[PDB]
Design a protein. Sequence first.
Lengths: 112, 112, 133, 786, 29, 123, 56
Amino acid sequence: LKRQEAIAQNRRLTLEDLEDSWDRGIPRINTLFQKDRHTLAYDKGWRVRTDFKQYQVLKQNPFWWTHQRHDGKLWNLNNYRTDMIQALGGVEGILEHTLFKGTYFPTWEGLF
Amino acid sequence: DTKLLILALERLKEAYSVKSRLNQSQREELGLIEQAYDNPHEALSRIKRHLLTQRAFKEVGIEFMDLYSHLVPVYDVEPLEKITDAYLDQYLWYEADKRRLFPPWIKPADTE
Amino acid sequence: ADRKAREAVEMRAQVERKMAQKEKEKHEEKLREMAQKARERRAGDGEARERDEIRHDRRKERQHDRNLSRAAPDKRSKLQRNENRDISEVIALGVPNPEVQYDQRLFNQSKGMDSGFAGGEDEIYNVYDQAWR
Amino acid sequence: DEWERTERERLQDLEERDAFAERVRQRDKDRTRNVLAEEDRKAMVPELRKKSRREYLAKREREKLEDLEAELADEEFLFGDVELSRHERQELKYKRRVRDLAREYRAAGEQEKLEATNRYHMPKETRPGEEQRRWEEARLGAASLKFSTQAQQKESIQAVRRSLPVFPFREELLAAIANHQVLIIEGETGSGKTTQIPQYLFEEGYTNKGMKIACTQPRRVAAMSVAARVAREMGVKLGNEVGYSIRFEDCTSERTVLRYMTDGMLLREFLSEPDLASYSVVMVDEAHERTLHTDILFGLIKDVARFRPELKVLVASATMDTARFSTFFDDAPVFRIPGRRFPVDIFYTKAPEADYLEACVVSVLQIHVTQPPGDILVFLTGQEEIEAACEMLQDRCRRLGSKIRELLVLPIYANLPSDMQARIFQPTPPGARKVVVATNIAETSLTIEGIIYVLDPGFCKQKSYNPRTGMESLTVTPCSKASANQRAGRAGRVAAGKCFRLYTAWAYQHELEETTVPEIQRTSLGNVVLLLKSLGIHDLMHFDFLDPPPYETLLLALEQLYALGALNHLGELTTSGRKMAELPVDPMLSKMILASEKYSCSEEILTVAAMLSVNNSIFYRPKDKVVHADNARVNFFLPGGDHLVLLNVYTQWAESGYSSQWCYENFVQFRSMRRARDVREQLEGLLERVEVGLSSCQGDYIRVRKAITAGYFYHTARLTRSGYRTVKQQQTVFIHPNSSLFEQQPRWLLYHELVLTTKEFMRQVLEIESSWLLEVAPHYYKAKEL
Amino acid sequence: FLLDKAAPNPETKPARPDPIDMDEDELEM
Amino acid sequence: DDFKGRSAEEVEEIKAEKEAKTQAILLEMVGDLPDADIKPPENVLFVCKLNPVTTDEDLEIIFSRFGPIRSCEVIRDWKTGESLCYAFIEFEKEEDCEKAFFKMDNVLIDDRRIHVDFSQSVA
Amino acid sequence: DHNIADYMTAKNNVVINYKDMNHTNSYGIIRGLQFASFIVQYYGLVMDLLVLGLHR
RNA sequence: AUGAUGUCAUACUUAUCCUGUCCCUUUUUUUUCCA
C-alpha cells in the first residue's frame, strides 16, 4: 500500500518506511534490494532443483529446503553469543579458566 | 541466453565451494566452467550444437550415499554434458514457468 | 494416435476460429450502426470564427503537406515525425512529462548470487554474520 | 575583395548546378523510351479495376488517416475553452465517437487475429526496462496469503524582463548600434544577451523591409532553447515568425523575422545567399566558442561589413577576447554590459596536488558531510575517470551507511545513455544531495539550477594534432585561465556559491594561458580547405584569416586532397573535387562513396558512411552488465572488418523496424543509431546531386572492401615483426582492443582513426589487400613499397 | 545418412597417422 | 473453412475482399457517403499534380483530344477559388477514359509531369 | 521441440558403470541428470490428471 | 668425402632474462517536379 500511494503521491519511498520492516516477511524485505535482482529473476524452479541435488553430490544438504538469495535469511543468532557470554560469567569469569593471565597481555580487547 | 548460462554455471560451481582436494575430473570441470565464464559465446554455440545434433552420450557412473537407514543413488555425469544439461534445465524451467505449464498444485514450488 | 490427435486438434481449432469470426462480424455491424448514428447526431458564438479557423489551419495544412510530399518524396516524414523525438530537443520545447522508484541508500547493501549455505558443506564457521565486537 | 570573387564563383556555381540538373533531366527522359481487341479490353478493364479497387483501399484509408489525424489535430486548440455553438460541437461529438468507432472496428479484427492464433498447435517434426518490476511481484506473489491569466503570463514575462542587466541598458546600446555598423557587445551569462537583444531589434523595426534577424549559436539544441524562450516572450508560435533551422530540423516559415541557426547553418546560407540581402542583422553569439565555422564566418562577414554598410553585424561574446575581436574587426567600440548574478567564493588548495582523483573524492566527501543545503557539481576529465569516481563515492556510501544521508551520485558525459543524461535534470529529492560528476560539456549549454558548489581539477582533455606525422592525441592538459574562470562562473546562478580549485593561486595566476588554442591552429582542416576551394579561393595563403594555420598543416592538407585526386597537379578543384566538396563530411568518406558507384556497392557504402558519422558512441559498455554487453556485441561480429559489422548492425536495426528496444536488447546506443539513420537519408537527399546510382553489392563484400580501399587508402598499416607499422610513415601503431579483429591481427589493415592514447591507436579497422592499393592508387601507392 | 539419401567426441574418429619425423615425446613413450 | 484452404493467392485476395469491406464500412463509419460503395462511373479521370495556373478551359482542350468530354471540374477551395492542384474530368465513353489515360500518364504539361488515374470518386 | 525432446529422452539411455559392472539403461529414468526435475514433474502432471479427471 | 636449401625437433652457448598489450574530450553542415 505504501508503494501504490507513493506512486499516487509520486513521492519516493524513503528508508524510513522500510527500516521498521527490514527483516520481516517470508521472502524477506531485504531481498527486494539485493544486488542481483536482475539475474535472479530468471532462475525458476530452484526449489525442485535443490531437492534433486541429492542425486548428484555425495553430501547431504541440511538446508535443502531454502535458498538465501531467494528466501532472504530466515534467522539471526547474534544475541546468542552475547547472552552465552553473560551466562558463562562474563569475559572475566570466562578468562579465569584460561592461561590468559600467564600471558601478561595487558587486557583482552586486543587478543587475535 | 547469458542470464540462463550464468545461472547454470553458478549452480555447477556451488558443488566445489570448499575448493577441496578434489581430483583430476573435478579439476577438469572447473576448467571448463571458468573458460565458459570468460568466453560465453563459444560456450553457447557448442551448447546449441549439442542440443541439435547429439544423440549418443558417454557413460554415467553410479555410487551410493549411505544414510544408515536407506541408501541413495548418486549419479556422476561428465562435464561437457553437465554444462549442456544445466543450460537446458534452466531454459526449460524458465519457459515452463512463463507459459504456465504446471498447475498450482504441483508443489515443491518457488513461492513458499 | 498422434496422427488422429493432430487432425482433431486442427479441426476443432478452425471450428471455433470461424465461430468467433462470425461473432466479430456481428460486433462490427453494430459498430456500423454506431457510426451512422454518430454522424447523424453530429449533423444536427465562437463556432463561426473557430470554423473559418478550422478551414484556415487544415487547408494550409493540406497545402504544406502536399508540397512537402512534393519537393522531397516524403519530407512530411522528414519534418513532422522526426521532429517529435529527441531528448534535449524536448527539453527545449517545454514538453511536460515526455513506475515506482525509491531511495538508493537501500540498494546494494547486499551482494551475491549464491546461497550462503555452502552447497551442503557444513564444517565452515557461518553461524553469526557480524563480528562479535 | 576575396569575398566578391568568392560570391562570383558561387553564383556561377548555382547557375551551373541548375543547368547540370536540367541536362540530367533531359538526358534521362531521352534514355527512358516512353513507348506509351474487344475482349482484350473486357479482360484487362476488370484487372485495372482490381488495382483501382485495391490501391483505392490503401489510398482510401489513407485519406481516412488524413482526416482521422485532422479531427483530433484541429479540435485540440479550439474546443476545450471557447464558447462555440451547436454546429461544430455536434461535429466534435461526431468526430470523437466516430474515430473511436473506426478504432474499435479495426481493434475487433486485431483482437480476433490474436485470439485465433493464441491456441495450442501441436509441434511439427520437419527436418522495456522493468526487470525490477518483473522482480517486484515475484516477491508480492510469493508473499500473499488468501484462503486574463494569459495577460498575467505576459505581465510576469515583462516583469522579469525588466530585471535583466540589459533592460536598463536598452536604449543607450540601441542608439550605440544605430551609430556604428560594427559593435562589440561584451556580456556574461544570464545577461539576456541571447534572448532580449533580438527582441529589442524586433521592436526597433529592423524587421520591416521584409528583413530578417539572424542569431547563430555553436550548438543546435542551444539554438532551440534560446528560440523557445524568445518565442515564449513573443507569445506566438515558435517556428512561424521566431524560428530556427538546423540539420534535419526546419522550424521556420515565411513569416520568419528572427531566424536562429548554427554557424554551419549560416555558412550554408552563404551557399544560397552570398550578400545576405534579406537579413538586416546577423547576431553571432559567444563567438569565443573557437569553431571552424566561427572563424570562417568571421572573415566572410567582415568582408560583407566592408561591402555592405547598412548591413548589421553584432557579434557578442562572454570573455575578454574583445581585444583581438576589435583588432581584426578594425577597432569596433566595446559596449560593456555588467552581468553577474551572485557572488562566487573561489578557494585554492594550500599546496599543489599529487593524486587529484582521490583529492576530488575526499573533497566531495567533506563538502557533502559538512556543508549546508545545496547541489554539487564537480569536474573530471571523462568517462573512465568518471565511473571510477562514482565507484569511489558509492563505495564510501556503502561503507558509511546511515551515518550519512542520500548521496545521489550522478555521472554525466556525452555518450552515456540519454535517459541517464536526463537523470540529472530531476529536481532534487528533499533531504538528499545531488552530486554531479561531469566533463567540460557541462561547462557550456548545460544549465542545471541548484548548483551552489563546484570544484575544478584545473585540467581537461585537449585535442592536439601535430601534422608532423598526422598525430591527433586527446591529451591531458591543465585547463585554460578562461576555462577555470567560467568553471567558477558555472556556479552562483541561483545563490552565493563556491568554487574550489585543486591548485593554488600561485599556479593559477602564474602558470595559466588565457584562451585555448583557436581550433584553426590545432584541428585538422580537410573539410574547410575543401570548402574554401568549393567557393573558389585559389590563393588560400593571403586569405583573410583571424588566426592563420601554420603553413605545414595546410601543406599536408593540400597534399592529401591532391592525393585523393580532388586537386589537379597544381592544386585546384576537379569535378570530383567540387561534387565531393558539397558533401558536409571529410573527403576520405566522400571519395569512398565516389568509388561505390564504380564498384556497385552504393547502399552499403552509404550505410558505412552514416555509421562512421557518429560511431564513437554506438555500443554501451556498462560495468554492471559487462558480459551481457560483450556478448550482445560479439553477436554481430562478421568477417571482413568492423565497418561491415556496423553495416550489419544498421541492417538488423532497420530490419527491426527501427526499434529502440532492439538497440536496448542488443546493447547499442539508440541516439547514434537514429542520427546515423537520418544522416544516411540526408546523404540520399543529396544522392541525386552527386550523380550516384542506387545499387547494392548483392552480398559481394569484396566490392565494399574495395570501395573502402579507394576511400581510405591513406589510412592503412602493414605488419612488421616489431608490431603493426604505418605504410608511409613507418611509425608504430597498435590494435584497438574493441576491434572485431583485435586478436585476428591481419597482415594488411585499413583504419579510420589515429589518436595515440596510452598507446598509439587506430579505431574501426579492416583487413585490406595490398593489391587493391595498387588497383586504386598506383600513383601514390607503388609496388616497391608493398 | 540413410534418411538424407532418401531426402566433439574423438573416440569415434579414426587415428591421425604417424608423421615422418615423430615428435620426440612420441618416440620416448 | 475452404475460404482459406484453396491457395495463398486467393487467400490474400479474400483478405483484400475483407479489408475492402472494412475500409468501406469504415468510411461509412466516419459518416461520409449516403449509399454504401456505389461502384463509380468509370467515365471520369482523376488527374493530379495539377498546376494552380491550369483551369477547366485548358483541361477541356487537352483532354478533348481523345474523346467527347462531358465536363471538367477542378474542386475549388471554396472561399479562395484557387486550384487544389488536382482535378476530375468527365467523358462520354469508357473508351475515352482509357484512350486519354494510356497516353496521358506521367506526361508534362506546364512544366509539371502530372498524373492520370481513373476516378475512384463516389461523389 | 522434437529436437529437445529427442535429446532429453536419448540422454536417459546411457551405460551405467560401477567398479567393473556395466549395463544399459533402457527402462527407467536416471535422476542424476539435471533436467530430471522437469521430467519427474511433467510425468507426475500426467498422473495428476489420471487421478483427478480432466473436469476436476 | 662435408652443397645450399630449408618452417626439423633435439642438443648446446653467453655467472647472458624473471623486465609487462588493456579502452577516445567537445561538436556544427544547404535540397528542389511528390502523386
